[PDB]
Every structure is written in C-alpha cells, then in structure tokens.
Design an enzyme around this catalytic site. Structure first.
Site, PDB file in Angstrom:
ATOM      1  CG  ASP A   1      12.208 -27.668  78.790  1.00 42.35           C
ATOM      2  OD1 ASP A   1      13.256 -27.257  78.288  1.00 42.35           O
ATOM      3  OD2 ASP A   1      12.135 -28.572  79.320  1.00 42.35           O
ATOM      4  CB  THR A   2      14.329 -24.161  74.168  1.00 40.84           C
ATOM      5  OG1 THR A   2      15.307 -24.133  75.301  1.00 40.84           O
ATOM      6  CG2 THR A   2      13.336 -22.778  74.190  1.00 40.84           C
ATOM      7  N   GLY A   3      14.509 -27.193  75.875  1.00 42.72           N
ATOM      8  CA  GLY A   3      15.259 -28.119  75.807  1.00 42.72           C
ATOM      9  C   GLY A   3      14.503 -29.702  75.651  1.00 42.72           C
TER      10      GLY A   3
HETATM   11  C1  LIG Z   1      11.084 -36.585  74.117  1.00 43.45           C
HETATM   12  O1  LIG Z   1      10.846 -35.330  74.612  1.00 43.45           O
HETATM   13  C2  LIG Z   1      11.299 -34.991  75.700  1.00 43.45           C
HETATM   14  C3  LIG Z   1      10.778 -33.904  76.739  1.00 43.45           C
HETATM   15  C4  LIG Z   1      11.710 -33.659  77.822  1.00 43.45           C
HETATM   16  C5  LIG Z   1      12.664 -34.226  78.427  1.00 43.45           C
HETATM   17  S1  LIG Z   1      13.504 -33.664  80.042  1.00 43.45           S
HETATM   18  O2  LIG Z   1      12.737 -33.297  80.726  1.00 43.45           O
HETATM   19  O3  LIG Z   1      14.560 -34.724  80.400  1.00 43.45           O
HETATM   20  N1  LIG Z   1      14.652 -32.392  79.353  1.00 43.45           N
HETATM   21  C6  LIG Z   1      15.552 -32.955  78.253  1.00 43.45           C
HETATM   22  C7  LIG Z   1      17.107 -32.594  78.659  1.00 43.45           C
HETATM   23  C8  LIG Z   1      17.852 -32.888  79.635  1.00 43.45           C
HETATM   24  C9  LIG Z   1      17.856 -32.558  77.322  1.00 43.45           C
HETATM   25  C10 LIG Z   1      14.166 -31.222  79.627  1.00 43.45           C
HETATM   26  C11 LIG Z   1      14.805 -30.322  80.599  1.00 43.45           C
HETATM   27  O4  LIG Z   1      14.503 -29.013  80.243  1.00 43.45           O
HETATM   28  C12 LIG Z   1      14.575 -30.815  82.012  1.00 43.45           C
HETATM   29  C13 LIG Z   1      13.191 -30.351  82.093  1.00 43.45           C
HETATM   30  C14 LIG Z   1      12.706 -30.689  83.528  1.00 43.45           C
HETATM   31  C15 LIG Z   1      12.430 -32.114  84.100  1.00 43.45           C
HETATM   32  C16 LIG Z   1      12.433 -32.330  85.542  1.00 43.45           C
HETATM   33  C17 LIG Z   1      12.159 -31.205  86.463  1.00 43.45           C
HETATM   34  C18 LIG Z   1      12.593 -29.926  86.013  1.00 43.45           C
HETATM   35  C19 LIG Z   1      12.721 -29.425  84.581  1.00 43.45           C
HETATM   36  N2  LIG Z   1      15.481 -29.932  82.689  1.00 43.45           N
HETATM   37  C20 LIG Z   1      16.271 -30.405  83.508  1.00 43.45           C
HETATM   38  O5  LIG Z   1      16.646 -31.699  83.582  1.00 43.45           O
HETATM   39  O6  LIG Z   1      17.034 -29.459  84.151  1.00 43.45           O
HETATM   40  C21 LIG Z   1      18.098 -30.108  85.244  1.00 43.45           C
HETATM   41  C22 LIG Z   1      19.036 -29.242  85.306  1.00 43.45           C
HETATM   42  O7  LIG Z   1      18.967 -28.127  85.967  1.00 43.45           O
HETATM   43  C23 LIG Z   1      17.655 -28.366  87.187  1.00 43.45           C
HETATM   44  O8  LIG Z   1      16.625 -27.668  86.519  1.00 43.45           O
HETATM   45  C24 LIG Z   1      15.391 -28.273  86.367  1.00 43.45           C
HETATM   46  C25 LIG Z   1      15.927 -29.428  86.805  1.00 43.45           C
HETATM   47  C26 LIG Z   1      17.496 -29.564  86.553  1.00 43.45           C
HETATM   48  C27 LIG Z   1      13.360 -35.051  77.749  1.00 43.45           C
HETATM   49  C28 LIG Z   1      12.639 -35.817  76.369  1.00 43.45           C
END
Ligand SMILES: COc1ccc(S(=O)(=O)N(CC(C)C)C[C@@H](O)[C@H](Cc2ccccc2)NC(=O)O[C@H]2CO[C@H]3OCC[C@H]32)cc1
EC number: 3.4.23.16
Lengths: 99, 99
Positions: free
Chosen positions: A25-27
């Site tokens: 996860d690059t995000g």
């Molecule tokens: C500080 O360290 C951190 C690590 C990870 C995160 S986070 O998970 O909220 N996020 C961040 C993103 C929303 C900026 C990462 C996104 O890639 C995050 C990873 C994830 C979380 C829950 C379920 C599936 C996938 N993906 C995400 O929110 O995607 C949304 C939008 O598209 C949908 O597919 C996956 C879930 C839905 C936050 C902080």
C-alpha cells in the site's frame, strides 16, 4: 517482480512466525497488521484514514519478510480490516511505482 | 516515471478544470477526493476505510488527468482525509508496482 493493479496487490508476508496476506500500500505511511499477539514492549498510537481513527499498538524493529524480501521496522497492530504494508517497509524491499 | 516511496507519492491532478494534489494509493480500490464541486449527475454511495464508513457522492465517467496521464472513470467525493487516487484510475494510466 512487477505487480499490475487490476486486483488488490496482495502478497504473502512472514511476521512473528506466521504467514499472512498483506496489501502493498503506497498510500499507507506505516505498516498496520490485523490483531495478533506479538511479544515485547509497545506504545499506543492512533492512525486515521477514511472513516476516522483506530487505536493500535506500535512495535519497533519487527522483522517482516515480504515476498522473500527481508525487512525490519515499525509495525502497528490493531483492529484493521486488512494487513497493510506501508512505505516504511516498501522502501526497504526496493518497491517503486512506475507508469 | 519511477517513483520511490521514501516520501508520500503525491502528484498533481486536474479534474473539473481545477488542479489539485492527490496521493497515488495502491491500497485503495477507488478514487476518493475531498469535498468539491463537480459538474454532472451523481448518486450517493458508502465507502469503508480503516476507521469506518463515510457517505460519498459517486461521479461516473469523469475526466481526470494524473501527472500528465489521462483517465476517465468513477470519482468518489466526500470527507476523506486526503485526495487519493485508487486502482480504478491507476490501471488506466498504466501504473504498476515493481521490486
Ligand atoms: C500512519 O500510517 C497509516 C497507514 C494506513 C492508513 S489507511 O489504511 O487509512 N490509508 C490511508 C489513505 C486513506 C490516505 C491507506 C489506504 O490505502 C487504505 C488502506 C485500506 C484500509 C481499510 C480497508 C482496505 C484498504 N485504503 C482505503 O482507504 O481505500 C478506500 C478507498 O477505496 C476502498 O478500497 C479499499 C478501501 C476503500 C492511515 C495511516
């Protein structure tokens, strides 16, 4: 290897003696793993994304193997719906985005 | 280009004729942008993240240019903490993970 993004970029990881599936996860700034009972000391942390914040336990200097690539760094453990490999570890395995 | 991950993979996007900054997010299935005015019809949907679910406005077949590459697809608009570009658009610009 090269991973296309038609489907979720899930790969197998090895952590704390267990094999798991996790998202490259690059995000994600940090690595967040589903609830597991790791040994050692930890510090509370709060991480936020879509929907709000969750409480997690921060473990430091944890060894993780990602597709046979070894890495060691900070791992957060808490009620995440998915195992997330974040940039702190993706850099260590030489992962890049390309287009 | 080849993008390393020691920093957030933030890029400039153009949508609705306006420039913004967005995060290339391989962990997101969908593209979710902060509250903005977009022309055309939309339908209310729900999306779930690490912290729970949010209400968003779904815009279909929206033109959006990402770091100079054109895409046309679904864009969700709602109270996300960050503009994220998800796999639905990353595939369109030919983005892959490599290590
Ligand atoms: C500080 O360290 C951190 C690590 C990870 C995160 S986070 O998970 O909220 N996020 C961040 C993103 C929303 C900026 C990462 C996104 O890639 C995050 C990873 C994830 C979380 C829950 C379920 C599936 C996938 N993906 C995400 O929110 O995607 C949304 C939008 O598209 C949908 O597919 C996956 C879930 C839905 C936050 C902080």
């Amino acid at each position: 290897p090269q991973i296309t993004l038609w489907k979720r970029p899930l790969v197998t990881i090895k952590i704390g003696g267990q094999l798991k599936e996790a998202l490259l996860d690059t995000g994600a700034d940090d690595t967040v793993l589903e609830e597991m009972n790791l040994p050692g000391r930890w510090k509370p942390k709060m991480i936020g994304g879509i929907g709000g914040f969750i409480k997690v336990r921060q473990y430091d200097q944890i060894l993780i193997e990602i597709c046979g690539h070894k890495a060691i760094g900070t791992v957060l453990v808490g009620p995440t719906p998915v195992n997330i490999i974040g940039r702190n570890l993706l850099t260590q395995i030489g992962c890049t985005l390309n287009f």
